[PDB]
Amino acid sequence: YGYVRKVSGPVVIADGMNGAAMYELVRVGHDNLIGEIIRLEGDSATIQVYEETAGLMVNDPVLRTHKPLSVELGPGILGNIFDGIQRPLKTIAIRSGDVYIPRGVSVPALDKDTLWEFQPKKIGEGDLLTGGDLYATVFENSLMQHHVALPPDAMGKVTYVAPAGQYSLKDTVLELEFQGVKKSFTMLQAWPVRTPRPVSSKLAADTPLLTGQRVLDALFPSVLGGTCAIPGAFGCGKTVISQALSKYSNSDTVVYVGCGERGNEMAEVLMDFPQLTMTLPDGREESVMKRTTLVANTSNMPVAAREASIYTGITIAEYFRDMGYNVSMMADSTSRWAEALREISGRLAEMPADSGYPAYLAARLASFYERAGKVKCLGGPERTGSVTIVGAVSPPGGDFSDPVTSATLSIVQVFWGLDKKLAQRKHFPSVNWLISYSKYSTALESFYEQFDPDFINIRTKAREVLQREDDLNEIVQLVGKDALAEGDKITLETAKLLREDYLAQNAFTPYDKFCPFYKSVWMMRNIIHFYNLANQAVITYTLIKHRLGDLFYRLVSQKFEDPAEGEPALVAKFKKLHEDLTAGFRALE
Amino acid sequence: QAWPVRTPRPVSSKLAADTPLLTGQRVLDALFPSVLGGTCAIPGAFGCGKTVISQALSKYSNSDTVVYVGCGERGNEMAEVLMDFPQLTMTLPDGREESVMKRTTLVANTSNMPVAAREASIYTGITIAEYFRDMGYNVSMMADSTSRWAEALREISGRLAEMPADSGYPAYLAARLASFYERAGKVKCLGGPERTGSVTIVGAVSPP
Amino acid sequence: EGTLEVAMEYRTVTGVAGPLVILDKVKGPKYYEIVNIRLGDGTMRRGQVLEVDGEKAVVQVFEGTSGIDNKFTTVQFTGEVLKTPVSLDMLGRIFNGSGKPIDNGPPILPEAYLDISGSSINPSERTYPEEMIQTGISTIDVMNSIARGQKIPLFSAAGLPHNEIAAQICRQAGLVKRGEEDNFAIVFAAMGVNMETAQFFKRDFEENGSMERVTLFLNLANDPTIERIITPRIALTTAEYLAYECGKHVLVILTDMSSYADALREVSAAREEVPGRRGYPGYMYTDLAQIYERAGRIEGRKGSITQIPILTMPNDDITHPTPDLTGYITEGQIYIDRQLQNRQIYPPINVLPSLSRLMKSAIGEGMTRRDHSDVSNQLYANYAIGKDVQAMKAVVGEEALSSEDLLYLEFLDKFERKFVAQGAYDSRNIFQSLDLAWTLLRIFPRELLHRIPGKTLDQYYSR
Amino acid sequence: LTLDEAIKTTNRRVNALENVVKPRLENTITYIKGELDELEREDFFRLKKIQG
């Protein structure tokens, strides 16, 4: 019930919708075009329809949905591929057979006829349960067990519990009554993208995001449930860091979110993920897709879907965190999302602000980024998850002055700063140590000292060495290495060794594909301790260089050690080289 | 008496001003002099606190009467004026000792006061000075932050949805500001005796 | 007394667009009347009636227009402007943006309902600030000091430790003591702060033990953008009640005033108002006045409201509309430099652009020393000459610094090294710091000093 | 002597000239886009309001 009255491009006016609500999604026309309500002036409505509105007919029916832009969660959310508006691309392609996306597809987000193995908890048929209680878990696939949380805003004494067995989402797995009225819940939960997910308490982040790369792990650490920023526009560093996060990061799940980038780039990345495979610490070999969800919205996709992809991804990450899993979101291109928002604002004729973006761009970006953090779960049993966002930025020409870049730098705690100059100089990590920073180090210091009380001092010494590296750089630039003292020469040599041996990774090489934090800490110790032990001896710099010449080659070899031998064997080899270097440093003095 | 605040006070015939304004400042009276009847304007960008020159000029001018009509200015400046002008003093040729507050009036409304009253502030100030001039004195004023009476204009032009001319200000901004400034000048007043009072408009324009 | 009336509940909502909710057939509306909107789902949110024309009403809802149905939502007209239930018992508690008690405590039992945006003080009754303040940081007190009733903000770009400086000032706040009941009660507005910053503020304030005299008005970035505009209003109204109507001096603090500017910009762009510079509303000067222009001392009452805002230059540019208008209104600046932060200085206060327009009255003979003004002027003026010498050395060479310029360069170096730097918890007294300030001024010869007379500092004696 | 002259010229160009020009470019960009573009939309918006 409801018919269109005026169709001016994307904007659509439909009469006979007195009961419509603002921002309630609606189905327009026989083709089931999907659009969101904007203005409810009079008894009429106003809808902007995402897909092309060409060919609409006046008095074509309009069908309400009684729900805002929402995502159907539950089993089967992992692995698949979804559009910006939560449209399963893979199943759509299989059903329609052809390649093109049909104008008005109506495939449900998750297949409601597929069977999943279900088994309840030890709860009784007449017990009491509340919102967020974990009443069952499901083996969606191997090694990615899926907990079934009773939806929030639903509570009451237990009435029926489905016994363990094979079931589908259409089955009524749970039924309960709060008052005399009883409600039955299936395995599918719908939640609006704009509304965050209910939380019990925002904890303080207390565990680093071990990305497997030494430069990110030690120099500029990032904590679970913490924002991150990447100036990714070239050098494939964004692809490299995304692959590292998918394969080696501590997160139990990853939710890539791609909006408004080049279509072939998304093709390449979405073909790369299935090829990516990660080995289990127990020796098992798995596929990253078994723990990966992908929301990719290319440029050809409607602008509104491009704007909504980010919220869809963050809501998916929150739902994953609802069962205490550590999940990491990855916004492919926040700049593209901002451009989509700008296009939408221009469609709405909103008053332009700085550089043309709407005045709420900073506020909306902050609202999105504020959802990341380590959070206590809702409902029992007691557990705690985390959601960390590693959303990248694409400043125009590298000038960190655009409002998107400025707001992101103002909100994001940790900025890693990939540099194209290092990529030109053949640097695999490509992380510019001169601009990166980790504002969460003060909070992470508790764990840093618990693991090793000397590690934080080593990090401070390394930061001082990096700061003096540029000083020695202009010193050599203006007068040369001749004017450098023996201590200055030792400091410069140690800085160069740190840059070319530990601060840089080798990625492609099997020995340096993954850098454990143990190996990183031992390498940092074997570098800094040797640097000091050589420093206080100031001995002629040339004489020290000849004596330590074998040691300099040995330090490169210490980095060359594979993690195959296990963390202790590599640590002992690093320690043995460090002890030999220390023995040479003190005895020869 | 009574007088409409927008209609200027009638005169006999305006005439050229040829007496310098002894401000007591080296720069104001040496390189860039001002005449008793002319119009001045001090930009004083943010942070300069240009009102210090205003207060010094009011304190030490040769003008017989000063009407400090600061519009949109901070209240603490008005508190300073009310606190110091009585305790501060000046001497006259007769030899006696008297305060400057005996001849200074403030039509000022602060910035936290309602916006629409600012134009009324400016116009009441200029009319009061015009009356004191028709008395025959060499009265003067200085309107602090006249640029605030452009925010007053555009915050009304926006409600009326008038067509924005430049940076949101209506079209008649220059016309109205000229109609205000063009009321200064030495003039033989109406009626005998032959009073020849003047009036000086030392405005202040705060630019963004 | 006039008989009471129950507020009319309407259901004639006949239009929603942006953040503005239209109504029709309103029987006797009132401008700025607070209306709480109950949606069809039953959830309730507050709102103000922006424009009243004829029998219509253009309401601006607070929690957002989402979920409003043109035939199921109900609007109730309370018939009174927004009022904050201020009370003396409100001390030592935490409140939401609109004032909801969030410390797991019972709501405020109001001693009196007071309307926000209170009327201005008659400037005839207004007085002048005449007492210094012991915040606990050297460089702010020694030069560009703060008076008990003076407004002055902190200019500090994003990422700088200005939040830590504000927390240290609030925890170490106290009178000169040259009393506890009337001692500094701190109203701590927090407009648009991060959750981590919010937890930091709560923990730091609870740790110093001064919870008994500090009120937090926290408003996170998650809260609605319009609700951030009323947070400074509520904070300043509570400050007004505490100071003028109860006596104790109030040291009002508002963090991230740029967030308030952004909220103003968003609200104005929602209603499509005339834009000033950088798309900000054309009345931003008046709004920043109604926020800032309340600090001062009233003649008949012994209270005093001292204002210490904390702005943030967006592009680290002083010419941005928010800091420019603030400097127009705020009677002085205390500036924080990113360049000094690059030198690893904990309190990165740059003194070259930092001046207190009321310092000429805070100084005197009742407090401080008789050489305060001249020493401050010299350490303010010779810094510029040292900077010029540094620039000349950069553009010419080390040989350009003559027997005079090299002295200025050494003065600048020692001034940035010893004088500005201070401990994270150092309560450096004025005289002990003024001795080192005199030493810095004495690095230059005691006769080349042009502005200062020799006798002024000669009255004071070393050792 | 020649190296001193060349170094002085290079240092002056790096410090004075370029850092003089770039603020000028930023101010010119702000004056055009920050004002003229904003005014054009506001003028047209007011015109559309008049039509409505």
TrEMBL record, chain C:
Gene Ontology molecular function: any one: actin filament binding
ATPase F1/V1/A1 complex alpha/beta subunit N-terminal domain sequence ranges: 13-79
One Pfam family, short name: ATP-synt_ab
GO annotation (BP), single: actin filament bundle assembly
Residue span(s) of domain ATPase F1/V1/A1 complex alpha/beta subunit nucleotide-binding: 136-356
Entry keywords, A to Z: Hydrogen ion transport, Ion transport, Transport
Domain of life (superkingdom): Eukaryota
Domain ATP synthase A/B type C-terminal span(s) in chain numbering: 362-461
CDD domains linked: ATP-synt_V_A-type_beta_C, ATP-synt_V_A-type_beta_N, V_A-ATPase_B
Gene Ontology annotations for the cellular component aspect, listed alphabetically: proton-transporting V-type ATPase, V1 domain
PANTHER family in the cross-refs: V-TYPE PROTON ATPASE SUBUNIT B (PTHR43389:SF4)
Family: Belongs to the ATPase alpha/beta chains family.
Oligomeric and partner information: V-ATPase is a heteromultimeric enzyme composed of a peripheral catalytic V1 complex attached to an integral membrane V0 proton pore complex.
Xref: HAMAP family: ATP_synth_B_arch
Task performed by this protein: Non-catalytic subunit of the peripheral V1 complex of vacuolar ATPase. V-ATPase is responsible for acidifying a variety of intracellular compartments in eukaryotic cells. Non-catalytic subunit of the V1 complex of vacuolar(H+)-ATPase (V-ATPase), a multisubunit enzyme composed of a peripheral complex (V1) that hydrolyzes ATP and a membrane integral complex (V0) that translocates protons. V-ATPase is responsible for acidifying and maintaining the pH of intracellular compartments.
This protein's name: Vacuolar proton pump subunit B
Automatic annotation (TrEMBL), chain D:
Organism: Citrus sinensis
Name of the featured protein: V-type proton ATPase subunit D
Signal peptide: none
Family that this chain belongs to: Belongs to the V-ATPase D subunit family.
